[PDB]
Amino acid sequence: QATINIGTIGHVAHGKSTVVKAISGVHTVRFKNELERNITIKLGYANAKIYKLDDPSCPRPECYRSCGSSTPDEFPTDIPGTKGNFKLVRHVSFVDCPGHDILMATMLNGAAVMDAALLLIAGNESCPQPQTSEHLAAIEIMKLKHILILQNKIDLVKESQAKEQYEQILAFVQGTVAEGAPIIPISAQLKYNIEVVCEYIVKKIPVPPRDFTSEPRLIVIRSFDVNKPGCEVDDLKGGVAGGSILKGVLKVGQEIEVRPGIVSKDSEGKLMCKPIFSKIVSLFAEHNDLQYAAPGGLIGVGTKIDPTLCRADRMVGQVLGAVGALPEIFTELEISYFLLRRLLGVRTEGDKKAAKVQKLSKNEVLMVNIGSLSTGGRVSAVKADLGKIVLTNPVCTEVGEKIALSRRVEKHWRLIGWGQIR
Amino acid sequence: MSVNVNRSVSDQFYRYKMPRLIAKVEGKGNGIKTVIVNMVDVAKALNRPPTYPTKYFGCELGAQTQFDVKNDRYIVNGSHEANKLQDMLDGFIKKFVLCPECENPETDLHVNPKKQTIGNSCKACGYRGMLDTHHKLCTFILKNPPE
Amino acid sequence: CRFYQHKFPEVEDVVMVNVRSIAEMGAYVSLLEYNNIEGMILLSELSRRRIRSINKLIRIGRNECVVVIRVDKEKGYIDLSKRRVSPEEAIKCEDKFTKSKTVYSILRHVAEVLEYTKDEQLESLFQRTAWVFDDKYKRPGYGAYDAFKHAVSDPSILDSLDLNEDEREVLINNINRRLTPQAVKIRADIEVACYGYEGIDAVKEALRAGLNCSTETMPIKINLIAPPRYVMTTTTLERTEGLSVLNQAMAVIKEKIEEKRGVFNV
RNA sequence: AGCAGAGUGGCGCAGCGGAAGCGUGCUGGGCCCAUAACCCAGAGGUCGAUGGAUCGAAACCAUCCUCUGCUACCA
RNA sequence: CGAGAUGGU
């Protein structure tokens, strides 16, 4: 399955494809009859292995040469060793986090399903790049301290401008996160130095505690593969959920459920909403089928549901567990909150409305996030630090420790702060 | 080849881009035609009916124009090769839908044909009003409202 | 040879013709449903309004539709007109001609048996079977093409008379080589997406309950434009008969999930 | 993947179960003192593979191939 | 009461 799961995180115009291939061998993609843009804009994945010879290097699947293919005019090459037998370090897979702040709820969810972060940096915009606070301040508030930095698109950038970038970032983080994350430089075009990223995901990142025998918990985000061909047109395979198990051993034929579920039809409102449950039909990980599974790793879980739920990611940010589980389900929320010391998202040569956030009012709709879920929140009562709200879809957590808060401060919602349940 | 929608702006990164407009000169003297070949694709790229940009050339040049559902030819009568259109290919933007506050023709029209009025609105800075009363094409638009 | 019952055309009806020459008073023409007999269209009968050139109304070797305005039986004189003909009557003329050309293409080929020395065999093969198969129906408006279509579904039509084996097989083939694509002409449209958490077991009845009392071998054909737009074929029946099976199938498709705690728009 | 088009004889639009189909473009001739309008005539010819009825196949019917178009998915 | 514009030596 896996020992750890790593989120590749960044900002607009930094690229994706070359570096996500360099750390895994896998092209991150979403299927569309259209051209591939500079970024995978919405949350994805890349399956991987990490392995070495007897001496520090990251080989190709043929071990004798590191020979590249990302540039048409050159063959950059080194010898890891004289065709030595490779050794696996540990089982790992990557969470391909959103490329634009428009998906900030899905980004907080991606940052919750990872055990650690890779934060990606590029020369395409001015030095004090703001997402170095925006991700890492939320990541500290969701208590996930495990962080690394990766300087990607610098193929034509001088060492003094590469310095000015990391040094204006090092000055900027003083109010938002600890400086203690290592930086790895690479080339995006030449695949130069990329095996140091592999070494640092062994060097910096620990294996986290989980309970192997306590009651099942799972986070789901992805509608996994089901396909059109068949002699019976309905329910040939059933819908498959892509997720990561938080807690408990899991097995084929076990009854599993999703906590927020759905609102029942012919209800007059938030009443009569219920969990949804079924027996697990199959399991998938590491390009193999399974009968059993464990906490701490990315997995596909097979279910009896209609594939019409799976033709798109309807299943973004959902919490799952054993049928009839305890954890409280919220369709309305009691909140206490705090707001960021600057407005955030983009920057240039001098101030662009970067002042402190204006207080909330009841005539508005929030986007609000808890655990690894998301919902839209409408106010019943509020003050500048405290409130009471009703939710357009239900949400769930094992404890009410934290929430994250986004406001329509302009045409689409931006993060403005965080809070707790009362 | 391809171009910016208007050449009064020299910027490579300007928001408006389109295919070339190419035409055939046909016939012989005392009976010459100029036929515009790309006109349906250019009208689709500019989000207007193909009658309006064709009619604007006849209003400026002082010439007859033809339209035909049987053959799909759009025609400006007489020889109008090279510079005779290409000095003024901007005009359908430059005399109608440039905002006076900023050079950004992200601009829409709405017609009230029962009350002799054409409404105008540009998304770039919120500029709104009507088309001009000395300008030619207003008498054609009110008799031919948009789809 | 003649395609029809009678030696000469009747007055004030439409014939298919081919143009041979043009002169000072009219165009000279051969009638096609008769044995290439001569007739003429006068230049006064071509149009209601002024003619810019004659060559774009008529040219030699082209097929044409015209009414017969006068006939003299004894001398063999026939007068033709084009000013009269409406476009519905031209379509009707092409249907009569196509239904006749197909029957004649059977009989001309079936005649290539015995001695076949003279057109006497063509006229002898046209008489009896093919003639008694449509002389009875001139007023209703059918031709022997419909009797041949009846002889395809049941050969008792042929068994009623003196017969030949080419006259059986060539007759059948000139329908069946074109009629054998008796293709699908009805399908259902359904908006259903399924609530059932037991669906991979439970929906296999809704996929198979669509008709009662079949063989266990009986197929149905099922289709999909996209997952929320389900489609089914009504047991390969034609659009003249499958309308009951269409209404039953869509009712059963919704019933075998509304029976199972689903709810949908009727 | 559901349904549709194309696979020149001359640019381009693709007729109908008869070997160009018609409106149009090109080239030449007539008419006039001359140019346009109008009139007339030309252009070397199995139109992707494999079967079958025909006097006949780009155009009556199967089975494969490929790209577009609208829906919209094995990816 | 069809259609019938124009003009380097």
Q: Nearest nucleotide, C1' to the C-alpha of B27?
A: D36
C230 closest CB neighbour out of A233, A238, A311: A233
What span, in angstroms and rounded, lies between the C-alpha atoms of B96 and B107? 9
Exposure string over C104-142, b if 16+ CB within 10 A, otherwise e: bebbeebbeeeeeeeeebbeebbeebbeebbeeeeeeee
CB-CB under 8 Å, A277 with C197: yes
Contact call for residues C38 and C9 (beta carbons, < 8 A)? no
Which residues contact residue B23 at a Cβ distance below 8 angstroms, ignoring those fewer than 6 apart?
Answer: B34, B35, B36, B37, B80, B81, B85
Distance C181 CA to D5 C1' (A): 21
Alpha helices (runs of H) in A114-211, residue ranges in sequence order: 131-141, 159-172, 195-203
C198 closest CB neighbour out of A276, A304, A307: A304
Chain C residues 150-179 with Cβ under 7 Å of strand D are 170, 173-174, 177-178
Dig out the tokens for A372 from the structure.
């690894």
At which residue do the structure tokens 């476009």 appear? C87
Q: State the chains in contact with C (3 or more Cβ–Cβ pairs under 8 Å).
A: A
Residue A8 sits at the vertex; the CA angle it makes with A185 and A95, to the nearest 5 degrees, is 150
Residue A386: CA atoms inside 13 Å, Cβ hemisphere, count?
A: 1
What span, in angstroms and rounded, lies between the C-alpha atoms of A180 and A42? 28
A238 closest CB neighbour out of C199, C228, C263: C199
Dig out the tokens for A303 from the structure.
């279910």
Q: Nearest nucleotide, C1' to the C-alpha of A29?
A: D75
Q: Nearest nucleotide, C1' to the C-alpha of B30?
A: D36
Output the CA–CA distances (angstroms, integers) from residue A276 to A220, A235, A257, A270, in the order listed. 14, 17, 5, 16
- Which residue type, as a one-letter code, is found at position A68? G
What span, in angstroms and rounded, lies between the C-alpha atoms of B66 and B63? 10
Alpha helices (runs of H) in chain B, residue ranges in sequence order: 39-45, 51-61, 83-86, 91-94, 138-141
Dig out the tokens for A122 from the structure.
């590029």
Dig out the tokens for C88 from the structure.
């519905």
Query: Which of the nucleotides in strand D have any atom less than 7 Å away from a protein CB atom?
Result: 1-3, 17-18, 22-26, 35-41, 52-56, 60-62, 71-75
What span, in angstroms and rounded, lies between the C-alpha atoms of A81 and A130? 41
A161 secondary structure, DSSP code: H
Q: Determine the angle formed by the axes of helices A104-113 and A131-141, rounding to 10 degrees.
A: 50
- Which residue type, as a one-letter code, is found at position C17? V
Relative to beta strand A147-151, strand A116-121 is parallel
Give φ, ψ of A115 to 5 degrees. Answer: -90, -20
Whether the beta carbon of C98 falls within 7 A of nucleic chain D: the reply is yes
- What are A46's strand-pairing partners? A94
Q: Which residues of C touch A306 (CB under 8 A)?
A: 193-194, 196, 199, 227
Q: Is A41 buried (19+), middle (13-18) or exposed (0-12) by CB count in 10 A? A: middle
Q: Nearest nucleotide, C1' to the C-alpha of B31?
A: D36
What span, in angstroms and rounded, lies between the C-alpha atoms of A240 and A225? 7
CB-CB under 8 Å, C230 with A234: yes
CA nearest A121: which of A198, A24, A9? A9
Dig out the tokens for A81 from the structure.
């060793």
CATH for the stretch C13-87: 2.40.50.140
Give φ, ψ of C245 to 5 degrees. Answer: -65, -35
Relative to beta strand C26-31, strand C63-72 is unpaired
Q: Hey, which residues 50-89 in chain A have their CB within 8 Å of chain C? A: none
Residues by CB within 7 A of strand E: list them.
B 30; C 50
What span, in angstroms and rounded, lies between the C-alpha atoms of A329 and C229? 33
What span, in angstroms and rounded, lies between the C-alpha atoms of A154 and A122? 6
At which residue do the structure tokens 């934060």 appear? A119
Residue A83, number of CB atoms within 10 A of its CB: 12
CA nearest C148: which of C100, C108, C182? C100
Residues in chain A: 422
Which residues contact residue C62 at a Cβ distance below 8 angstroms, ignoring those fewer than 6 apart?
Answer: C18, C19
What span, in angstroms and rounded, lies between the C-alpha atoms of C52 and C30? 26
Report yes or no: A255 at the C interface, CB cutoff 8 Å.
no
Dig out the tokens for A230 from the structure.
């068949």
Give φ, ψ of A13 to 5 degrees. Answer: 60, 20
Report yes or no: A265 at the C interface, CB cutoff 8 Å.
yes
Residue A148's Cα: distance from chain center in Å? 15
What span, in angstroms and rounded, lies between the C-alpha atoms of A148 and A278? 39
Q: Which residues of A touch C189 (CB under 8 A)?
A: none
Residue C79: CA atoms inside 13 Å, Cβ hemisphere, count?
A: 13
A305 closest CB neighbour out of C199, C201, C206: C199
Dig out the tokens for C59 from the structure.
């040219």
Report yes or no: A233 at the C interface, CB cutoff 8 Å.
yes
Dig out the tokens for C130 from the structure.
């093919």
What span, in angstroms and rounded, lies between the C-alpha atoms of A395 and A367? 13
Contacts 24+ apart (CB under 8 A), A399-405: A400/A328, A400/A370, A402/A141, A402/A142, A402/A370, A403/A333, A403/A335, A403/A337, A403/A368, A403/A369, A403/A370, A404/A108, A404/A138, A404/A141, A404/A368, A404/A369, A404/A370, A405/A337, A405/A339, A405/A366, A405/A367, A405/A368, A405/A369
Whether the beta carbon of A75 falls within 7 A of nucleic chain D: the reply is no
Output the CA–CA distances (angstroms, integers) from residue C114 to A138, A323, C125, in the order listed. 99, 87, 12
What span, in angstroms and rounded, lies between the C-alpha atoms of A337 and C32? 95
State the smallest CA–CA distance between residue A296 and chain C in angstroms.
27
Residue A54: CA atoms inside 13 Å, Cβ hemisphere, count?
A: 5
C88-178: CATH topology: DNA polymerase; domain 1 (1.10.150)
CA nearest C262: which of C210, C214, C193? C193
Dig out the tokens for A240 from the structure.
């498959």
Contact call for residues A117 and A177 (beta carbons, < 8 A)? no
CB-CB under 8 Å, C193 with A235: no
C199 closest CB neighbour out of A235, A277, A311: A235
Dig out the tokens for B115 from the structure.
């009350």
Exposure string over A184-217, b if 16+ CB within 10 A, otherwise e: bbbbbbebeebbbbbbbbeebbeeeebeeeeebb
At which residue do the structure tokens 């080929």 appear? C109
Question: Resolution of this entry in Å?
Answer: 2.9
Residue A38, number of CB atoms within 10 A of its CB: 14
| Expt. technique | cryo-EM
Q: Which residues of C touch A237 (CB under 8 A)?
A: 200
CB-CB under 8 Å, C223 with A233: yes
Q: State the chains in contact with B (3 or more Cβ–Cβ pairs under 8 Å).
A: none
Q: Which residues of A touch C197 (CB under 8 A)?
A: 276-278, 304-305
What span, in angstroms and rounded, lies between the C-alpha atoms of B70 and B67? 9
Contact call for residues C252 and C198 (beta carbons, < 8 A)? no
State the smallest CA–CA distance between residue A361 and chain C in angstroms.
39
Q: Nearest nucleotide, C1' to the C-alpha of B24?
A: D25
Q: Is the dihedral of CA A77, A82, A83, A89 positive or negative?
A: negative
SS3 for A410? coil
Dig out the tokens for C160 from the structure.
């009623």
What span, in angstroms and rounded, lies between the C-alpha atoms of C137 and C5? 11
Contact call for residues C98 and C65 (beta carbons, < 8 A)? no
Whether the beta carbon of C105 falls within 7 A of nucleic chain D: the reply is yes
SS3 for A336? strand
Query: In which element (H, E) is residue A392 found?
Result: strand A386-396
